[model samples]
Target: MACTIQKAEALDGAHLMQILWYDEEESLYPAVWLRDNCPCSDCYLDSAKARKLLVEALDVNIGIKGLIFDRKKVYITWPDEHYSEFQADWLKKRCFSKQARAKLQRELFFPECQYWGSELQLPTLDFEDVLRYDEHAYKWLSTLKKVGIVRLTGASDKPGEVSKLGKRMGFLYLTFYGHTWQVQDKIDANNVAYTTGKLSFHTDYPALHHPPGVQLLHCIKQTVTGGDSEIVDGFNVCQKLKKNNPQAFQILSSTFVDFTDIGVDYCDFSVQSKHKIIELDDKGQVVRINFNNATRDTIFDVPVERVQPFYAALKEFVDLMNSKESKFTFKMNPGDVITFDNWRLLHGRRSYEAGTEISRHLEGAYADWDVVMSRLRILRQRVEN
Candidate 1:
């Protein structure tokens, strides 16, 4: 930020400090906030970058002894001789004004979504480059947040390379499918992905209460012809069609669809969870898509009349995704990986001609946004420092 503080004064009665910016903008910083967020080595543990100041230790009637500021920083003295320092940029972001707080909430909760169509060519990066450099790794994670999907090439032909790429972000998100799973043709396949069949556009593991946020699929062998990968930007379609077809959008977002899966992977088990087809946040923005036809429950638990509208809305969404301009299709070569946001993008594949077990093979692994965002923020901090 190109912002700097021009002046600062402590307001004893109001329990706030008024700071004026060089740009002439001004905001009040709460006195309690200042002491609670003290950045000194004792108040905050620099090694962990976490607050060591216990909440009970905070003094409610805390008074500022003296406040001083230069162009870019402000130093504050408490009545107890404790000290607090803040960058003008940081203070500006946490301003008491509603608008400033709203802006910060959006950045913390929502990631920028880049809507794309059939013409979109997925961003590609080299596997080795991302594993080797923080800059490249940052680029990979940030792009996934924005675009919902990206491709990586130049991985070793040996199996389970998805785990290597996955760990760069954090630990693998474990499921009933295990730490990392293999995708190959099987005679007694319990999962549809294990068979040689065309898969419809769907988000993986909708049955889980909290499904994996990110998925990585590494293609180790792709000799067959029609094994093309297809993706649909669920966020793009919801934002585009919500207003145009209000009834459809309203029903989809309001209705809860039961997703269930029963099979023997690690062991005999059954999983069932209900989720909205189009999940909306407090601001009514589409945040997640939980759609998987294969995992849908057989029974529709809705009002008799409501059932009709639910199916209609779901069909409309499906039709939009099936449209050529909305579905982006491509092929993955050997040693390629598709890393995508399972929450925002729907993924599928075209069935290839059946051959031996090793003919069409891929390895899959999962990661979550929590770990990825943490790593991204860490790299961003190091770069900024």
Candidate 2:
């Protein structure tokens, strides 16, 4: 059986001790504690300011740290952390305050949605091969699921019609100025080199708690000498570690990573979030993937006792990511738009010339898989009958 919430009556300060259970093991959480946190119309006004009432009118601080199963109404702690009683069934719904509920779902539940993936392979032009819908609709939906990445190869065209082909495959043209567009002689030894420079393999958006579900990039131009987009399967890397080093895997999973970008050319670069490398959603299905090195801050949320093993496991995973054997590379050029499943695939480019001749421009966009799949299911229904 999956986890089920238990009930507890907080006599005094006992509830504070059990608060940790609110996180690690939800099943062990007391129903009463959850009820007090519930954000109904009474607790939170839909209005802008959450006006605090007078002391007596205001709710007291309370919780139900532990539970007692008496086959009756569950007991909870009062504002003073004193014991009170409420129906078990009713308390389950009220446990988390609205703000807290949103917080929990943002961090943990969002990753479990099991979004879908679709890819557009090029060179050969069979519309049905790329998508189930008509050619144009297939192009649009393909971009939607694959997140605006389309792969078309076996052609000769530099500046290779990426934007045009992406438009054909349903993506918009985009670019950024960084080391890619300019030359930076040397970066400080302690700091990572930044020049729109080549980056390590990872997904986009580690700073946002629930980054976009889909991301796509098509290779518009490739240098014959040195530009190859390298790819890694984070899911594969995580599973392997889970088997070889479960302890290390747990450390990385439970720990909070800092996604702070502190350096040049300003942007909001700091966020703390906890995520499991092998993300298992509420439904027990692995969904979202987070492996952004640029945003991976120092590790926190682990106990002092378990820090060493966790670090070792993290190092092992990094080694595996850096391994040439684990990578697959593709040299792409005009008319070739390669689309990949973003959440599952970690992508980066091998260093290339900073000169004007080797210009690389790609196009991209994002849409949640949940929205796309809902549309696809409706489309599939018409064919079923």
Candidate 3:
């Protein structure tokens, strides 16, 4: 695409610079419109699908709205009401360098999409196969890249079982809320199971600045009442949001979230993390999914003007999470252990009742994400292919 600069009036370099620098109103009608309407994916990832770049395009209306120029620089108003002050050196370079033009072109068109889940699902392996720490551990991990999570069974209710499995699956990247041991935390320990309270749906270990890469939870006991495990796909949820509110979703993906932890009694310090609400990998595909309502600190680096609509999008997303049709739930029993991708899956528990008639207890443990991923890469390569 050629960027054509139209001469507004008879003026020299010094005069033009002066005009751009002094003009309080710098909206460039034709030039801004031309840049806004330019046929470039970089300007707008998907104008029809995302609408993030709708305001700025190449086919602008007409007549500059504001302009200021001085000896060294020129300022122009953008369609989004943002103003751009271009330095004389930058303009001079743009006039002389083909490389700069090519760079602009690159910025105009970017690839979209990334791979997050496991590529293959190895369903044939049994719980004992993994419990005994068979080669199957390596088997399932290999194919998990495309799908992001895997399930392994073959154990029964026994003390230190998940920890045993975790040990065999060694080298895990442990996390706090995510990598916690599931054994019933006694009153002396952190608050244990809430026999009747509803668990807020969320991902684990979000308090950390850089959340864990992967997560594994093994169920050692399941003799309880109404405690079915549920898993919701974050990628699928984002895709749905994109379809319903493309602009909002785009704003979310563009903006960042600050997940904080005050350290409290554990440490005398606090930590804060910044992440885009919806993130894509190098390929422009959604990869690591991190949404934890329990740990979400606050929104940051967002346009103060758009907070209202942005919050609406966030609330709508939380409502979608409650939709039963979009999630999978099942009661876990003895010897059943499940491992999932913390980045991609949001998990929760239904309220449970443990009374004289019904008794329920389960134990869990944590593993490091890198440990799981590395083992998976080696395991699957050797066994599942």
Candidate 4:
């Protein structure tokens, strides 16, 4: 569909311009914005998707000297002898009208998710189906985006098979844990994740500047009796916290928590960073959830008065996560590969008997959301086009 501009004219002493669209919508563009965003060869590099004019070079008081619109495009002339043109569709898409801006915002936020509890069955799809067809691959990736978690069943119990699945989504993220690591009982382990003890619900690598976005754990063997995996929707917990205790929710979102990891034995690595347990965007929408009790540092940078209240708030969040009704448990079997959004879902495990000789082994890896979604969108576009 092509957009048509019904009229265009200077506004407010030629400082801005008002454009009336054929759809009866009007948008105001500052003269400086119009000049800076000029789609001319001299103003922008089309191939690079970058602006040719540096911000420092732009005149602050620049104003449109003349404006004209035909059925197909709009033309502008600046006092500095710079001329520019924009396609009708392009300008319409960039309109700052409330309705247009709202529509663009919705598209940029990715997908809205439905939070779930243990009552909900584990979402799964056949591994062969995803590997065999592009359509199935698209659907499988879409499910991960919408639900934040999914189980891919029927993969052969082979070494490095998890990498195949990771490739399907995006580039595998190599971390301090290496490209991919095994999860099992180990002696003198630098990380608690290597031990067989009961684990708590939390995201991984909070000590990093930006932790992994997605985590994949492929179960190669699971003969254990009590090593069932537990998952909790952190976004769902935040929703409940916001509703039941707004003050606690606010504190968790505002206060910073230190996460530190100091390695021993094989790897002499130490890292530390601070972030809120619950992160919100400028619009106050829940964007991320970071909680890892195992690696949290005791150092407090916040005010002394806020310390007690912060703990109170932290306790409220901990209580909700520990609540029996909040977690969804699934006993992963051989050939089962589970993937989830590390930023949104907290994963843990129950304790199993150490003397039973029940072999429970899994391979784990990480991939970022940017690459995963980019691959998904490209595949979708190929299919749609």
Task: List candidate 4 segments past 4 Å from native.
Answer: 264-267, 298-312, 355-358
For candidate 1, write residues 249-287 as lDDT tens digits: 999999989999888786677999999989999999888
Question: Candidate 2 at 66: error in angstroms?
Answer: 45
Q: Which residue pairs in candidate 4 have backbone atoms (N, alpha carbon, C) closer than 3 angstroms, thus clashing?
A: none
Q: Write the per-residue lDDT of candidate 4 for residues 1-385, one digit (tens) a residue.
A: 2377888889898988887777777778889888989988888999999999889868889888988888778899999888989888777777787888888776555576878876667779888888777787887777788888889999988768778877777569987787888888777878888777889888998888799989999998885558998998898889999999999999999999899988753356788999998999999988888888888888878989999999999899978887788888889988999989999998899987665453788899999889888877777877777
Candidate 2 structure quality by residue, lDDT tens digits, 65-125: 4445443354444444445444444444334557656765653323322221122132233
User: How many Å off is the CA of 23 in candidate 3?
Assistant: 66
Query: RMSD per prediction, one decimal?
Result: 3.0, 12.3, 16.0, 2.5
Q: Once model 2 is optimally superposed onto the true structure by TM-score, how far is the C-alpha of residue 339 displaced, in angstroms?
A: 2.6
Candidate 2 wrongly placed segments (more than 4 Å): 1-196, 262-274, 283-285, 298-308, 322-325, 356-358, 382-385
Evaluated with TM-score, which candidate comes out highest? 4
After the best TM-score superposition of candidate 1, give how far the Cα of residue 145 lies from its true spot, in angstroms.
1.6
What Cα-based lDDT does every candidate model obtain?
0.86, 0.49, 0.56, 0.85
Pairs of residues clashing in candidate 1: none
Per-candidate TM-scores read 0.88, 0.51, 0.58, 0.90
Of 1 and 3, the candidate ahead on lDDT is 1
